[PDB]
Amino acid sequence: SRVCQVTGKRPVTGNNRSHALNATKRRFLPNLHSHRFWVESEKRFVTLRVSAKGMRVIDKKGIDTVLAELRARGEKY
Amino acid sequence: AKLTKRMRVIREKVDATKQYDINEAIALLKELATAKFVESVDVAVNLGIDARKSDQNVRGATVLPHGTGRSVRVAVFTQGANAEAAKAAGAELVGMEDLADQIKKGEMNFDVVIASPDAMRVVGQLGQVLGPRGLMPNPKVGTVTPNVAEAVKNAKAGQVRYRNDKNGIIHTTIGKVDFDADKLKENLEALLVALKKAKPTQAKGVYIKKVSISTTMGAGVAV
């Protein structure tokens, strides 16, 4: 799965559809990249998987209000 | 504005791709004035008429209630002792058959005319030279009035003129580049009223559109 590790964006069910009367499945897949961040509480760099719409959130909110509260129990990152 | 040694040094403060906030443009209007004394601004009324049709051609003026600055030289048409208190109120010249000998030659040693109804019987001999100079008084305008001394004092607020020949919009002076933009709006409101009282019969479709003021390398902004 192409998961945006910084937001939980996953693939979704959906149809292609065009100007045609016959309708066929698509299932929307994300574009998937990596990005590296600094954690001032652990004084180390970490690498996370990122995607469109999701990578737009973290840069806007700030890592000290996103990545600094992202662990649900630890997730070994 | 003309490109000069004292103008280059303010042209370097502005970019050909950049526009300004309404409140910053009313400062740029004075920056762009290169003279050591405060310059004057001309404003366009946004119209509304065919640029060359004579049955849509506009020509006239209106007198302001308080004015924006400099005063006008006033002449009074009245009889007898009634002129002396008008000379004390704001008249520089008196309408007499002695002065009518200069008026019939087209020579107006004055900027505004006020008339008393029984002396208007003399002005009706001269209306054909006062007419094409904007000077002819008329009862619908209130420039024919018995209280002439108070009315010449009312004239010192000055007047704003408007006419076309080849353009559908009309350009005219209204005051100094240092005049209050909120009071400019009030005098432009009085101008737009006089322009609706001066509306030609055949002015079909849209007439009064939105009005703005323009600067070099800042574009027009709403008044």
């Binding site: 600094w38 840069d59 806007k60 000290d64 | -």
Partner: protein, 149 residues
Amino acid sequence: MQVILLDKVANLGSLGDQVNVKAGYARNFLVPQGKAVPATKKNIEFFEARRAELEAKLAEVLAAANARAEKINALETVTIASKAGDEGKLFGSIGTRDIADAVTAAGVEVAKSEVRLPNGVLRTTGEHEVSFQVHSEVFAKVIVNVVAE
């Protein structure tokens, strides 16, 4: 890109107003340096207050002021040189102390090399001019030493 400044920067800043910058420049400098953020005008007072404790604690590991930024304008020259290969090439990078030093005082590899390069140490044995690294607010160049005499 519109951002608001959190610290006094000589090139840009508007009090209580966003300023234009490139997002790429911001993401390499002004953002990771803590000096700017996109919007958050409503929240930057609480962020500034959340740095106040962090910098008060940072003074426990480093509170010292720099004395070297005042000294740079002497254009003081390098006294160390690399030992060169038979072919007229160097062994490149291995440690930050066998390079650009002028005082021979260090006993271990330094955290800040005296010169700034995208890739450490040049393998050419000729005379070349490099940018002297003290702090990202004062600038100078110097030539490399190839003689040590």
